[PDB]
């Protein structure tokens, strides 16, 4: 093979020897707005976002029933 | 002036909402 | 659990035809959303009364199993009143249609 | 501390602004501390009245001021 379609990764042992391996974050945060929430400390949510979040304080048993 | 209106208890003591549970995530189920 | 007597009294009022006319009159200028919200609020008020008053108060039926026994007894009463009644009717129906045990018969041998 | 500011209506907080001072006990030793009612009233400019909790007796501040 040429090498264009090679495997796009490096084995964990070689990464560990390079000092490159990271283990963490089974989850992720796609948007920077969502990433920097815990660092902003003053507007974790915009005002519009806050009023939109206020609509889901409880689950909707009416919608569940319907 | 004296009080004469019949004051109900719902104007004073509000009951908590417990029929449908809380969403601490504040996000819908499909989301 | 609480107010079983009041619930029986509510059912008694509901089954009264005079109360049907009263509800017909009360339904003037009223919406299904309002009625549903009223019923949901009433039920929430009941359960919130439970959640609050159980912290400091004990009813005459208090027992080492608490309200679990009251809820079990409600369930068993419902069962014996409705489901066992239905079972009696279904038994007589099956016995008249096929004979006793007709619903558990084996398929006809080929 | 919580973001729960008591409503200054007399139905909730009887006698809020009848005098120009508020008092509080602080800590386990319960040291006394007196605060001007104007210093306290400064909070009710940041208080948000849409939000009401705990039997609708406490409002919430805006997060900027609270933080």
Task: Tell me what the structure shows.
This is part of a larger assembly, with chains A (66 residues), B (31 residues), C (110 residues) and D (67 residues). In chain B, 0% of the residues lie in helices and 0% in strands. Chain B is largely without helices or strands and 31 residues long. Chain B is rod-shaped. The longest helix of chain C has 31 residues, at 67-97. Chain C has helices at 4-14, 17-26, 32-53, 67-97. Chain C is 67% helix and 0% strand. In chain D, strands 1-5-4 form a three-stranded antiparallel β-sheet. By secondary structure, chain D is α+β, with helices and mostly antiparallel strands. Chains B and C meet through loops of B and helix 3 of C. The PDB classes it as membrane protein. The entry lists the keywords hexamer, membrane protein. Cryo-EM structure of Toxoplasma gondii mitochondrial ATP synthase hexamer, composite model.
Quick structural overview:
Chain B: It comes from Toxoplasma gondii (strain ATCC 50853 / GT1). Helix content of chain A is 41%, strand content 0%.
Write the layout of secondary structure elements.
This is part of a larger assembly, with chains A (66 residues), B (31 residues), C (110 residues) and D (67 residues).
Chain A lengths: L11 H7 L13 H4 L1 H4 L6 H7 L7 H5 L1
Chain B lengths: L31
Chain D lengths: L4 E2 L14 E6 L4 E6 H5 L1 H4 E7 L4 E4 L1 H4 L1
Antiparallel strand pairs in D: 1-5, 2-3, 4-5
Give structural attributes.
part of a larger assembly; 4 chains; A: 66 residues; mainly alpha; 5 helices; 0% strand; B: 0% helix; rod-shaped; Transmembrane protein (chain B); Cytochrome c1, heme protein (chain A)
Mind describing the biggest β-sheet of chain D?
Answer: 3 strands, antiparallel
Number of helices of chain C: 4
| Euclidean distance between termini CA atoms of chain D | 11 Å
Q: In what order do the strands lie side by side in the largest sheet of chain D?
A: 1-5-4
Percent helix of chain C:
55-70%
Largest interface: A-B, 9 and 11 residues
Strand tally of chain C, please? Answer: 0
Using only CA atoms, what is the Rg of chain C?
22 Å
From the helix content, strand content and strand pairing of chain C, which structural class follows? mainly alpha
- Estimate the strand proportion of chain D: 35-45%
Give the CA-based shape of chain C: extended
Order of helices and strands of chain D: EEEHHEEH
Give the ordered list of helices and strands of chain C.
HHHH
Kindly name the structural category of chain D: alpha+beta
- Treating each run of at least 4 consecutive H or I residues as one helix, how many helices of chain D? 3
Helix content of chain D: 10-25%
User: Care to count the β-strands of chain D?
Assistant: 5
Amount of beta strand of chain C: under 5%
Specify the overall morphology of chain D: globular
Family (chain A): Belongs to the cytochrome c family.
Subcellular location (chain A): Mitochondrion inner membrane
Protein name (chain A): Cytochrome c1, heme protein
Organism (chain A): Toxoplasma gondii (strain ATCC 50853 / GT1)
